[PDB]
Amino acid sequence: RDDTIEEFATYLELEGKSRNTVRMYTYYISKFFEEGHSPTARDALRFLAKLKRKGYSTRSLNLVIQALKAYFKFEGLDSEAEKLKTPKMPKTLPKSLTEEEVRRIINAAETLRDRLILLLLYGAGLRVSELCNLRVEDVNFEYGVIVVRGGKGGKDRVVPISESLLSEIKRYLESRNDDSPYLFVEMKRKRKDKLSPKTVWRLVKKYGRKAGVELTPHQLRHSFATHMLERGIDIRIIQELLGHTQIYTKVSTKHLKEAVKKAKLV
Amino acid sequence: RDDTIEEFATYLELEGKSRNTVRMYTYYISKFFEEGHSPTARDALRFLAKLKRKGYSTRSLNLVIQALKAYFKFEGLDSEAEKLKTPKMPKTLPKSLTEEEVRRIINAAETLRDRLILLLLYGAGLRVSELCNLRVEDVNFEYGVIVVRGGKGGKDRVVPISESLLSEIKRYLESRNDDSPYLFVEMKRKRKDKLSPKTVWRLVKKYGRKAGVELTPHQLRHSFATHMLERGIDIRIIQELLGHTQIYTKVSTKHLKEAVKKAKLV
Ligand SMILES: [Cl-]
Ligand SMILES: [Cl-]
């Protein structure tokens, strides 16, 4: 019942936690279960915002959050554990890009590899790391989708793509003399390892310049968002395709079909 | 050369970083490369402790650390990236346990599963999470070792074990009607999932009480350390076996043989 919390505290002592932090965590954890909250990511938040309205600092909230998170790891509930991430400060973004601009950026590609990167980042709206990490095995030709591996503690995801894109991928894969798992690779002294985010970033500004726009990888993911919506795709599916509980997969390949996104330039 | 850093900053803006934090990171990163330091975990530290001796706060150092770490992820150098962890505050531990005490704790086991847990935590000195996560595939009967999977960003490791221990494992595995990957499992409504750290902790106090000692999982890993050394095994190998650049594997199985650790009680 409570002897657990005594144990949780020494747990933290041994993980190198400061005896005052331990004091604090233990404090809030006890309080949490005193209310009657249950060991989930929902009751965490329904406990946290009560504090917020009661007037608690940001550093104070951040601490409570991380206290709960550490506890969940201890209970072993690692599902509920990563759900608790302190939502990032939302920035406003540059104006969304147009079809004309996207066309000019795509068409600026020196190589097919570069082209496929751009086309994926936008036609599939990938994050830079999803891209940097996407293993070629995840390009599923039978269903005509990319599977975007769920990251450190996220969820797997399935982005349908066109035959046109699936074609260029084949063409490009045929052309690959290496044993690297990854869809994209950069040449080094150590021939053929994985892309960094720096590299995607360098590469995106390159073509951004040639097509005459100050550009970033995100700008492509975001125009994906915008245009999917301009086309008349309900915001929820788009919010599905993008990641960030009615889901489907033959509807995704269907609605992404009607969008004709990538096709409307290649 | 430097246009990278401009890009690194917007990188952080988009990851939701505060424009002042970005100011700071960028500040220190520039400074780092101004010295002439090279993008590694070593020159990070040879840069950090210079600051420390120049008088920089803890929160100030922690910030610089995390600035570099974020940058490395961006360069894609994820090798050097996790090497930089701010070393945990070292606690002093309870007095090391004796052979007699270890025997009494082992022998207190209700079930074979419980016994094997205790015997591993001590005879193999595992961390609680290494234990909670060890997949049964990693029990290598041909070489007579456990392979301890390197964690989130650590390194794989190989702990030799006795035939006696390898025996009980077989016996116990024969007795397993489930399809869970893991060497140890706990019964729930959701029959046969993985152990939490709470569970190992509950279980260790149980047998700790029966044998009459206030005990923790770490106390077992630590007595492993002590006794390996009492026996005359050079501290470096022990420091190898434990994890936390001359390495070997037929020397580990050899020296761990001479220790007769587990044998000296079962
Ligand atoms: Cl279809
Ligand atoms: Cl041997």
Residue numbers in the entry:
A (entry chain A), B (entry chain A): 9 to 252, 258 to 279
Paper text:
In most bacteria, chromosome dimer resolution is performed by two site-specific recombinases, XerC and XerD, whereas in archaea only one such protein, XerA, is thought to play this role. Here we present the first crystal structure of a full-length archaeal Tyr-recombinase, the XerA recombinase from Pyrococcus abyssi. XerA displays the canonical two-domain structure of Tyr-recombinases and assembles as an apo-dimer.
The final model has a resolution of 3.0 Å and displays good stereochemistry. Surprisingly, analysis of crystal packing of XerA revealed that two monomers, related by a crystallographic symmetry axis, form a putative dimer. The interactions in XerA are mainly stabilized by contacts between the two αK helices. The XerA structure revealed that the extreme C-terminal αN helix packs in cis into a groove located at the surface of the C-terminal domain. The simplest interpretation of these results is that XerA follows a cis cleavage mechanism despite the unusual orientation of the catalytic Tyr extruded from the XerA dimer.
